């Protein structure tokens, strides 16, 4: 299908279907296809894919924690080249946040 990689688009897809849209691949998957972060070759080895799906450890504790809740993150607005600073953050109980300033600040969007 066509790539879905905008805040609303992914946000709505995660709530509705409880999974990321099909254009996302984890860091490990990307690495097994030949991704080399420093080269910025993700679209060469995985055309139309974006990094998304890995566990988000919420290291600064800015997102709300709960026993049982784990978070995950995925890149937003990415097409090719070096990665940007936009991410979408989503929890096991479907809370959805974003960040556009490389995890300095977060806004609750669902």
């Amino acid at each position: 299908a066509q790539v879905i990689n905008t805040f609303d688009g992914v946000a709505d897809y995660l709530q509705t279907y409880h999974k990321l849209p099909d254009n996302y691949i984890t860091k490990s998957e990307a690495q097994a296809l030949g991704w080399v972060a420093s080269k910025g070759n993700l679209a060469d080895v995985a055309p139309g894919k974006s990094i998304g799906g890995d566990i988000f450890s919420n290291r600064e504790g800015k997102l709300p924690g709960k026993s049982g809740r784990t978070w995950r993150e995925a890149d937003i607005n990415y097409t090719s080249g070096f990665r940007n600073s936009d991410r979408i953050l989503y929890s096991s109980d479907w809370l959805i946040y974003k960040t556009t300033d490389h995890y300095q600040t977060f806004t609750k969007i669902r």
């Binding site: 860091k27 972060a37 890995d54 290291r59 600064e60 070096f82 600073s85 490389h102 995890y103 300095q104």
Partner: protein
């Protein structure tokens, strides 16, 4: 591959530490200077192999509060995650 050095005796805040890291690891200009920003840089930006030499660790803990240990921990987890990171603590 890439070599980074932290002269811990020159670290006077957690801002210094993050800004030293931004230069030494060739991080993005948008680098968020936070623990989440560093993990993401370590696992989706940084060129490897990576050798981090952190000198005067104890002194760098004085004005970074809990920051020196937190940052260190992020590199160790990154290394536990498979990243090719060598850490040298002096």
């Amino acid at each position: 591959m890439k070599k980074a050095v932290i002269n811990g005796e020159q670290i006077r805040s957690i801002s210094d530490l993050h800004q030293t890291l931004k230069k030494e690891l060739a991080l993005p200009e948008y680098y968020g200077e936070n623990l989440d920003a560093l993990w993401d840089a370590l696992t989706g930006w940084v060129e490897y192999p990576l050798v981090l030499e952190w000198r005067q660790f104890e002194q760098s803990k004085q004005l970074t509060e809990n920051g020196a240990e937190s940052v260190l921990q992020v590199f160790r987890e990154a290394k536990a995650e498979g990243a090719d990171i060598t850490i040298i603590l002096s």
